[PDB]
């Protein structure tokens, strides 16, 4: 019954001092509800879930002001990080930022996080205590000394332990019909002859929420990882997710294999057979 | 720290004026406010980072620029008498953190420079009844007939500024509060012991610093140009 | 004003508790500040608070309640230096730091044995120009008339209230208020 809220930020500079592309997204669990794209015409935070559209105009103005300040901060960071690593203006570089909070089934604070990355590599991250930093390299150590003197950790701790949790509860209440739900996976199995001596069984899991799920193949009731292929959990586009797992079996022995499905929306673990 | 300049200015209506503000604390967010009676501080413009600006609560009539991290000037395009206020610059590490304010700028916009007048200062000597009733002597300094109210009052005894035994009116009062463009008045008290006042070697002086017209301001009047000056009054000690 | 404070001016004697509150309209505000401003000076920060609850720093206690959009400041053992205009500042997102209208707080001296009197002071011994000085009255006590300011003779450990009055008409009687006020002749 635990939940989470996360905010993702990306700023990608363009070649030759090109102004960055800025995209921000907000998630409640596995559900996106807000977005900001610097290439969009509105230049404002925009709703992506119905339960967030019931907020007032000052909510959207305030979120727009804060997210624009993020982009302007990343715009300065891209120039600063270009000097820290002695890089030229010809290339394109990326700043990523992610923070959020987890609450347990009692909706009480569980943990907070705030992570920063440059060109896909860890840069600086707030430790689990929300009081000390982890600097990946020497450039981030300079940033740590600046952020420690500016008391950034206690400011983020107040947001992660307070504002993040308080507004996560408000979201879980306003959109309880869609956020406090679990979609049990609808499952089926496909068969494909590979050669004269073997075939492929593929176990399907469709239209489930949240995205967390485990698919396990079994031969004679025993877990099997050999000759198996897992695919990454993917979105269906309607708010639900999909995943499949495959296994190559000897021809004529398809009936000896079972697919085990584990999902928090199922009232009981699910077992599939080729039929 | 953060510095602001100038700290006092008298402007004719329609003229353009730029107030300077510089900050070397590596602060990203900078702010401009105006302070008016009964309204507190009103956000004019702000700047989250170098290279960006944003409108505040009272953006009309003002413009800013943030070319770099240090400087954040405020420009009055066409001076309006309603822009008469006290302006404060401020900066913070980032948006949402505590702001550190500058010294402040007292700015008055007038429709006619002829309405500017320096103060008339007088020192009123202690009463004999007070000296015999309390063994203390209170001197009263009165500045009157000045406009605008860009004044600072200080006491001087034997050539040295004093602070103990002094209190000055917090705000100058208008001599014609029922009328417009009224001149202001300001008073202050200096209380010493009876024996200190009754020593004729002690020289008491009250001086009022008046911040007036700039040297570039055009003056086409017959009276003396009310420039920045210090008008003073004195009093000598005496036993009987 | 999107940020409002309790209207002043407020008056409290030395050693007593002073309380100032502040409300705001933006429910999503995340930082709140209490500033102190002396007459003709710059705003100076007293305390900041981010999270709900109480925050104590010496004689000062700040309280934040986001649900009711309410910020307050409690001053214990009010000192003469606490006399100032108190400004509430709330950040409305980004660099939109909005202040209140301000609340004037006056910490009055405790006059143990007040001796109220009205004296007439002349410009010189031979001058007719004069002013009126109402002085040495208790802090509860409150043609041109100025406000009262507190005078401090630090060398003698003596404090006293005083107000000044004058007019334009000649022979203006200063007798024109505590009932035991002394009016010499």
């Amino acid at each position: 019954g635990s939940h989470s809220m996360r905010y993702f930020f990306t700023s990608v500079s363009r070649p030759g001092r090109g102004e960055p592309r800025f995209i921000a997204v907000g998630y409640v669990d596995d559900t996106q509800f807000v977005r900001f794209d610097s290439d969009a015409a509105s230049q404002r935070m925009e709703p992506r879930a119905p339960w967030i559209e019931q907020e007032g105009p000052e909510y959207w103005d305030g979120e727009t002001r804060k997210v624009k300040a993020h982009s302007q901060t990343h715009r300065v960071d891209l120039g600063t990080l270009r000097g820290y690593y002695n890089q030229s203006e010809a290339g394109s570089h990326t700043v990523q930022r992610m923070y959020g909070c987890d609450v347990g089934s009692d909706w009480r604070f569980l943990r907070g996080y705030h992570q920063y990355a440059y060109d896909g590599k860890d840069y600086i991250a707030l430790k689990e205590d929300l009081r000390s930093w982890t600097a990946a390299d020497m450039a981030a150590q300079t940033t740590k000394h600046k952020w420690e003197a500016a008391h950034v950790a206690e400011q983020l701790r107040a947001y992660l332990e307070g504002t993040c949790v308080e507004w996560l509860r408000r979201y879980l209440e306003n959109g309880k019909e869609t956020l406090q739900r679990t979609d049990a996976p609808k499952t089926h199995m496909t068969h494909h002859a590979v050669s004269d001596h073997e075939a492929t069984l593929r176990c399907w899991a469709l239209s489930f929420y949240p995205a967390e799920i485990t698919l396990t193949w079994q031969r004679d009731g025993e877990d099997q990882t050999q000759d198996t292929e897992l695919v990454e959990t993917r979105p269906a586009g309607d708010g639900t997710f999909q995943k499949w797992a495959a296994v190559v079996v000897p021809s004529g022995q398809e009936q000896r294999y079972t697919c085990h499905v584990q999902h928090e929306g199922l009232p009981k673990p699910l077992t599939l057979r080729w039929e | 720290g953060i510095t602001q300049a100038p700290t006092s200015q008298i402007l004719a209506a329609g003229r353009r004026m730029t107030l300077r503000c510089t900050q070397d604390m590596r602060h990203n967010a900078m702010y401009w406010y105006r302070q008016d009676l009964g309204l507190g501080l009103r956000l004019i413009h702000y700047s989250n980072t170098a290279g960006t600006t944003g409108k505040g609560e009272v953006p009309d009539g003002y413009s800013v620029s943030r070319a770099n991290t240090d400087d954040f000037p405020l420009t009055l395009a066409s001076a309006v008498p309603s822009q008469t206020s006290v302006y404060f610059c401020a900066s913070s590490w980032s948006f949402g953190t505590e702001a550190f304010f500058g010294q402040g700028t007292r700015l008055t916009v007038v429709e006619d420079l002829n309405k500017v007048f320096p103060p008339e200062v007088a020192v009123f000597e202690p009463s004999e009844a007070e000296i015999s009733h309390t063994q203390k002597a209170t001197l009263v300094c009165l500045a009157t007939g000045f406009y605008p109210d860009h004044v600072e009052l200080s006491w001087w005894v034997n050539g040295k500024e004093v602070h103990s035994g002094v209190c000055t009116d917090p705000q100058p009062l208008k001599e014609q509060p029922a009328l417009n463009d009224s001149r202001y008045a300001l008073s202050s008290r200096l209380r010493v012991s009876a024996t200190f006042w009754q020593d004729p070697r002690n020289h008491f002086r009250c001086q009022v610093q008046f911040y007036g017209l700039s040297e570039n301001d055009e003056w086409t009047q017959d009276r003396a140009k009310p420039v920045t000056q210090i008008v003073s009054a004195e009093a000598w000690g005496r036993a009987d | 004003k999107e940020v409002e404070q309790n209207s002043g001016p407020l008056s409290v004697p030395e050693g007593a508790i002073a309380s100032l509150n502040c409300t705001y309209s933006y429910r999503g505000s995340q930082s709140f500040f209490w500033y102190r401003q002396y007459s003709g000076k710059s705003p100076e920060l007293i305390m900041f608070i981010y999270s709900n609850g109480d925050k104590e720093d010496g004689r000062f206690t700040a309280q934040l309640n986001k649900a009711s959009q309410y910020v307050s400041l409690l001053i214990r053992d009010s000192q003469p230096s606490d006399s100032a205009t108190y400004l509430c500042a709330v950040n409305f997102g980004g660099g939109k730091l909005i202040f209140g209208q301000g609340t004037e707080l006056s910490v009055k001296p405790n006059i143990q044995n007040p001796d109220p009197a009205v004296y007439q002071l002349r410009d010189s011994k031979s001058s007719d120009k004069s002013v009126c000085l109402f002085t040495d009255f208790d802090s509860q006590t409150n043609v041109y008339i100025t406000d009262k300011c507190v005078l401090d003779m630090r060398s003698m450990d003596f404090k006293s209230n005083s107000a000044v009055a004058w007019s334009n008409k000649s022979d203006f009687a200063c007798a024109n208020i505590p009932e035991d006020t002394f009016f010499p002749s």
């Binding site: 305030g62 981030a140 947001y159 | 980032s94 | 995340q30 930082s31 950040n91």
Partner: peptide, 9 residues
């Protein structure tokens, strides 16, 4: 989103 603790590197 966060209104504090977002500082340049």
């Amino acid at each position: 989103a966060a209104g504090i603790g977002i500082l340049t590197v």
